Write a protein that binds this ligand. Structure first.
Ligand code: 35M
Ligand code: MN
Ligand code: ZN
Length: 345
């Protein structure tokens, strides 16, 4: 994939069953070079009978997103509100003061997003522990994907919420997620159970460093106070600003019933079009490991997702364990190489 563009995939039912092999397949197709890929499951597939039980479900920690800034550069502050249900949230989301506006093309909605970002602060029901998969769904079950990230709980019992456990995200119009790569520069998977679309922007892993250089110029106090201030997931940067400073990016809209897959060191951001609900978790492959080892983490606060790479290096790269543990493994990552599990392809 020489243009590092966002690809879309339509696996048949036979290809869909083994998750790790399909991930490996799309990397042999170079999907990973965009940092983001969309996957459309066969029409024969569905993760849950109906979404009707849900109105009684609780959102423990609703977050009100207040946004300050101007001229393409914004900082998002997350004011926590008090708990509420899906029935309550849908009421406020479809309300006349928070609902989606009418529009022609997508480009129109996008303009309205970047123009009104900082007015009428919406509520985002984020980080809600839980799944909406029925127990019998055994293909692409975000709850139990069986990838090597499962080695983290198997050898230490540590469950990191949202990372090796699923998260549910209830959004309304204009709720967004700031520019970030995943914790420990992992993969993520995101399924949009129902409702209005979710739009995404993405920067190819091979240019992520350019985005960081730009971000440290725009936010010098923040750069100075943390080795990786973007992991705070508070920074929004408009596509025009990226364009103006010559950072390659791509955009995609995810509609209900479709998957997004993000790749290691793939910076991404986006917003919800209206009331919807999405499930998300991280995962890993053998290719992730070197990213794992070199990832720069937040340096200024505690309770930051940090994962011990020792177990991974001992098991999958034993020849370099001693060099690494002694700090002499000066390996250099090539963002275009696909994961070794694609030797089948
Ligand atoms: O909103 C989404 O659906 C979305 C899409 C893609 N990624 C995420 C995603 C979100 C987060 N967290 C955040 O964006 C976040 C922002 C402010 C906080 O105080 C705490 C957390 C951490 C990793 C992620 O992968 C969120
Ligand atoms: Mn993310
Ligand atoms: Zn920090």
């Amino acid at each position: 994939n020489p243009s590092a563009r966002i690809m879309t995939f339509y696996p048949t039912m036979e290809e869909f069953r083994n998750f790790s092999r399909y991930i490996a397949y799309i990397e042999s197709q170079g999907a990973h070079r965009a940092g983001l890929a969309k996957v459309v499951p066969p029409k024969e597939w569905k993760p849950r009978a109906s979404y009707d039980d849900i109105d009684d479900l609780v959102i423990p920690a609703p977050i009100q997103q207040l946004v300050t800034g101007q001229s393409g550069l914004f900082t998002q502050y997350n004011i926590q509100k008090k708990a509420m249900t899906v029935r309550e949230f849908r009421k406020i989301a479809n309300s006349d003061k928070y609902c989606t506006p009418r529009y022609s093309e997508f480009e129109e909605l996008e303009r309205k997003y970047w123009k009104n970002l900082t007015f009428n602060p919406p509520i985002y029901g984020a980080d809600v522990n839980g799944t909406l998969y029925e127990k019998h769904v055994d293909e692409w079950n975000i709850g139990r994907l069986r990838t090597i990230l499962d080695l983290v709980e198997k050898e230490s019992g540590i469950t990191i919420e949202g990372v090796n456990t699923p998260y549910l995200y209830f959004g309304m119009w204009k709720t967004s997620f700031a520019w970030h790569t995943e914790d420990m520069d992992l993969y993520s998977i995101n399924y949009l159970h129902f409702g209005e679309p979710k739009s995404w922007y993405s920067v190819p892993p091979e240019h992520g460093k350019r985005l960081e250089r730009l971000a440290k110029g725009f936010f010098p106090g923040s750069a100075q106070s943390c080795e990786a201030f973007l992991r705070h997931k508070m920074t929004l940067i408009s596509p025009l600003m990226l364009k103006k400073y010559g950072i390659p990016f791509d955009k995609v809209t995810q509609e209900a019933g479709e998957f997004m897959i993000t790749f290691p060191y793939g910076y991404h951001a986006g917003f919800n079009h209206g009331f919807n609900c999405a499930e998300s978790t991280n995962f890993a492959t053998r290719r992730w490991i070197e990213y794992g080892k070199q990832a720069v983490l937040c340096s200024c606060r505690k309770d930051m997702v940090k994962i011990s790479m020792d177990v991974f290096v001992r098991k999958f790269q034993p020849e370099r364990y001693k060099l690494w543990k002694a700090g002499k493994d000066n390996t250099v990552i090539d963002h275009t190489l696909p994961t070794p599990e694609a030797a089948e392809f």
